[PDB]
Amino acid sequence: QTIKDFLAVAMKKWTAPFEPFQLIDNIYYVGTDGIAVYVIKTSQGLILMDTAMPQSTGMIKDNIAKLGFKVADIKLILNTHAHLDHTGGFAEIKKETGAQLVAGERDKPLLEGGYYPGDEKNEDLAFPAVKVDRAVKEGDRVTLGDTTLTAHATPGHSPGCTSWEMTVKDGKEDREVLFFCSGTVALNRLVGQPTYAGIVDDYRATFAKAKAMKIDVLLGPHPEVYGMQAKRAEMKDGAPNPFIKPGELVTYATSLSEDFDKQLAKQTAALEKK
Ligand SMILES: [O-]
Ligand SMILES: [Zn+2]
Ligand SMILES: [Zn+2]
Ligand SMILES: [Zn+2]
């Protein structure tokens, strides 16, 4: 991977439009064609799950409005993980709304510094710094009105990467949703000068944890995590919700683990003196 390529994709594909929609029950998609952002409607206001690139905050706000939700009604902002493609609008929306920001405790320094871990001088991976109001750990519960999410610590992609679980209805029945935080290697260094200490063990633990979770609906911070666009095209009133696929996290985590092994081998070979 190259950082140039990460930036090129972030500026073409990840800033492109996608029409917002009700995904399941009180969870709404308001992201772009390449970065997933969600509104969760509660009885006491809105929870915003992530933002997008720093230059895309206006478009996220416009997507929220296309559903009839008010940006002013956002009470809580939750983060999956603290990289600029998910945190770019946090400072802006927090200031405009007075919302509180909730994030995994080990990502707090990243959020509060606005920098990429292990590459802290790289201005093109920086974002507007934002204060964390509540730092969460495994099992912590976050409630707004009628709605509660549970934090799961799923580190690797970032040290504080937090996957968020909540219950929704599909007709009369409960379904369990996971906003999975990301388990890609992406720009991280695994060996040599690792991006952070213990990164390899964190990824390992996260893949295993993901395969053991009982989850009906897999979501994530990029639509490619769960094949959003193909599912969206299959939505029809009266037909089963295509976002319900309870085996998907096991399949996806298996794919992530296999790619992880490839990247670890590649980076290990690249360390050899030549
Ligand atoms: O990311
Ligand atoms: Zn990331
Ligand atoms: Zn990302
Ligand atoms: Zn857990």
We report the CATH number of the domain holding residue 254 as 3.60.15.10
- Nearest ligand to the CA of 205 is 4
CA distances from 109 to 77, 84, 171 (A): 17, 14, 41
Is-contact 177 27, C-beta < 8 A?
yes
Is-contact 79 88, C-beta < 8 A?
no
Closest alpha carbon to 75 in 110, 114, 44: 44
Is-contact 41 73, C-beta < 8 A?
no
- Reported resolution in A? 1.2
**Residue 144 CA, ligand 2 centroid: distance in Å:** 26
Pocket of ligand 1 (CB under 6 A): 83, 85, 186
For residue 58, give the H/E element and its range.
Answer: helix 57-66
Residues 6+ apart with CB under 8 A from 94: 77, 100, 101, 130, 131
Tokens of 215: 């989850």
- Nearest ligand to the CA of 52 is 3
**Residue 239 CA, ligand 3 centroid: distance in Å:** 31
Experimental method of this PDB entry = X-ray
121 in a known ligand binding site: no
Query: What does the alpha-carbon distance between residue 5 and residue 22 come to, in Å, rounded to a whole number?
Result: 32
Residues 6+ apart with CB under 8 A from 21: 28, 29, 232, 235
| CA–centroid distance for 24 within its chain | 17
**Residue 12 CA, ligand 3 centroid: distance in Å:** 14
Closest alpha carbon to 182 in 156, 205, 201: 156
Is-contact 173 133, C-beta < 8 A?
no
Q: Among all chains, which residue has been given the structure tokens 């201005």? A: 123
Tokens of 204: 């390992």
25 in a known ligand binding site: no
Query: What does the alpha-carbon distance between residue 218 and residue 129 come to, in Å, rounded to a whole number?
Result: 29
Query: What does the alpha-carbon distance between residue 103 and residue 99 come to, in Å, rounded to a whole number?
Result: 13
CA gyration radius, the chain: 18
Give the strand pairing for 45-49 and 141-144: unpaired
Measured from the Cβ of residue 267, the count of other Cβ atoms closer than 10 Å reads 16
- The string of DSSP codes covering 152-182 is EE--SSSTT-EEEEEEEEETTEEEEEEE---
122-155: burial string, b at 16+ Cβ within 10 Å, e else: eeebbbbebebeebbeeebebebeebebbbbbbb
Domain that holds residue 195: 1-274
Number of compact structural domains in the chain: 1
Query: What does the alpha-carbon distance between residue 268 and residue 155 come to, in Å, rounded to a whole number?
Result: 21
61 in a known ligand binding site: yes
